[PDB]
Design a protein around this ligand. Structure first.
Ligand code: ATP
Ligand code: ATP
Ligand code: ATP
Ligand code: ATP
Ligand code: MG
Ligand code: MG
Ligand code: MG
Ligand code: MG
Lengths: 178, 178, 178, 178
């Protein structure tokens, strides 16, 4: 019944991190937030230049090797263990592998009560926000806007194309069982 | 005729910096961007704890003393001199003093060809974005959403309540004379 | 035998994060880094204004309430679970409670093979670096420089007062069993 | 007599920005700080991918084109105009062209009272700090450690190899005429 973990999936610039910060403010109990950004931040800088690490193409493409996966996997078991220990966890990720990525997460969460959230946004709109964010490599938002949702099953879906982050946070918070 | 400087005015979280980065991307010639954020960044950290410096109240209020003004004034003459020297300058500021703030800027720009831009956004919407930005002191967006525009005259007005940053950038870019 | 986790303890501005980034570069296998900075970053922003959250005094003091501890505890079990799952973890923390803080960590790591590292630095020198870092609240470095080491037991001790981060990283890396 | 502007020159990771923040804290009057970092930040992001913009090689090399120079030049006249208007300015730059770079600055400052500061640091030590800073492209520090000082004339020279930033700030502050 009680929601232990909230997992958001959406393309780059779809507005996930904004929604996450809104949720942390809205939800009464303290929720810990981790995601693709914090993981990469925690990983050695050289992982971004490594063999089977992660590589960001100049056109917005992304390649993930086994070195990166091995770590991410251990990290996933860790966040789940945190939830199991009583910490409310919010995870924002990018399911590059679509359904396969969701399945990978399912293998780690087991029977933990999870709230699966989909964060959609028009490709062209996301691209604009990517440019607005100033520093982002161009091309990622457009490339990930749709494929990351293929075959993915959600409990709640929000679309930031015409809805503010705080509004999507309200919609999501309503599906969180205390 | 040729636009030398673009000055944007709007409350906190109205979306100015996003628009500025979009303009830098859109406009063909290179535009240098400076604003309230970069100025404070350039000022001594102690200016934020000083006598007649700048003080951010816990409720989102802002107080500016003479020490801060003295510097800002010299800085303003500097950015104008940059434009005079041929650098295309974009300035994003918050006219806390309404018309008075615009008048102060006018005293510095002289007959320089300037494009005055107003960036409006619904107070409640701006507040939401403030929360989404995660780290912002709560209360500033609501407090500045309307008063900073009182008596201010613009050449172009954009409203980010229902328009993306890139879209507002297109509207503004159309009024920029090459 | 094989080192699974490296735990660094030292006062603010002692140079922990610099050493951690050097270790991630030096050590051949990928090491995940988490610490006080990333935890606070992951915690709701409101935790910094909460009842039994964390509070940074204007003079550099720090108060931790039960709300903060509850989360930190679950988080600690999580990073340990990550190590247990095969991820090499580096943790940089500030043992405000001295030996008590180390004991708390011991209760979580169990028999996991851990490398306890002490990072010392002259109080006045740390204070200077605090000022140099530009944005840091003044007073923290001096306050934490010595008490955080009282009764704490280390496997390796490095002193950054006259040694570069990369040098301390070499000293620490030599005690890491592959 | 009265010092109007302080210009620091040194290779990447030599510790310039740390010294600058120490100076802003130490010096009694408020000093505005601008440098290579703030300029690039103010320039369009695309300047880093442009024809005659700025390009950072993967090995730490740096190439500056005419597009970048044109802007920098106008910007230089601007900071000088700020000083002329009464704002105390601190500039931290990297004289890639050695004496030629200092000459370029001289053409802009005219007879303005300037304090020329040299910030040296052992190449290998700077490289280590580069790694410690975590995110810096490797190779820049070593490449710039010595050539940027060739034929450059200073009023004060500080060496951060064995001196803290705050200490170098004290040495520099002593040559600042009120
Ligand atoms: N609902 C929204 N309406 C308009 N702009 C938004 C909205 N949500 C977020 N933004 C803006 O979009 C930009 C990018 O969004 P954000 O960083 O939240 O995306 P993200 O999905 O977290 O990105 P990534 O997947 O790369 O980590 C930011 O500048 C953010 O402020
Ligand atoms: N048109 C928009 N639609 C939705 N979200 C937007 C829009 N423009 C900007 N945002 C988001 O609003 C937040 C705050 O906006 P931004 O930082 O651009 O405001 P600002 O006016 O520059 O703030 P300040 O005055 O404090 O410097 C950011 O998270 C940004 O991504
Ligand atoms: N060995 C060193 N010699 C000189 N300066 C150093 C050294 N190690 C780190 N520094 C500098 O000291 C400053 C503060 O150090 P750092 O941020 O690494 O400390 P920290 O212990 O991680 O801080 P906190 O506990 O607040 O997280 C930084 O500006 C850093 O570059
Ligand atoms: N005197 C010092 N002793 C030890 N570490 C130092 C000293 N001064 C600075 N550092 C550290 O060296 C690193 C790099 O220095 P810093 O960023 O100040 O260099 P910089 O010359 O400003 O770089 P750039 O030219 O790329 O802008 C930082 O992590 C900083 O904390
Ligand atoms: Mg995100
Ligand atoms: Mg702004
Ligand atoms: Mg640290
Ligand atoms: Mg610098």
């Amino acid at each position: 019944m009680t929601t232990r973990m909230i997992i958001l999936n959406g393309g780059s610039s779809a507005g996930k991190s904004g929604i996450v910060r809104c949720l942390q403010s809205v939800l009464p109990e303290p929720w810990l937030a981790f995601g693709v950004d914090s993981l990469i931040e925690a990983m050695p800088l050289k992982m971004q230049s490594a063999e089977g690490g992660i590589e960001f193409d100049a056109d917005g493409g992304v390649s993930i090797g086994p070195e990166f996966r091995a770590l991410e996997g251990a990290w996933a078991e860790g966040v789940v263990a945190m939830a199991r220990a009583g910490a409310r966890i919010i995870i924002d990720d990018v399911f590059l592998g679509g359904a396969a990525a969701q399945e990978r997460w399912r293998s780690f969460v087991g029977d933990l009560d999870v709230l699966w959230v989909g964060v959609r946004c028009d490709g062209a709109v996301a691209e604009g926000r990517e440019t607005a964010r100033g520093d982002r490599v161009a091309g990622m938002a457009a490339k990930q806007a749709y494929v990351v949702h293929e075959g993915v099953e959600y409990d709640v879906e929000v679309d930031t194309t015409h809805k503010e982050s705080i509004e999507c946070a309200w919609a999501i918070a309503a599906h969180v069982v205390p």
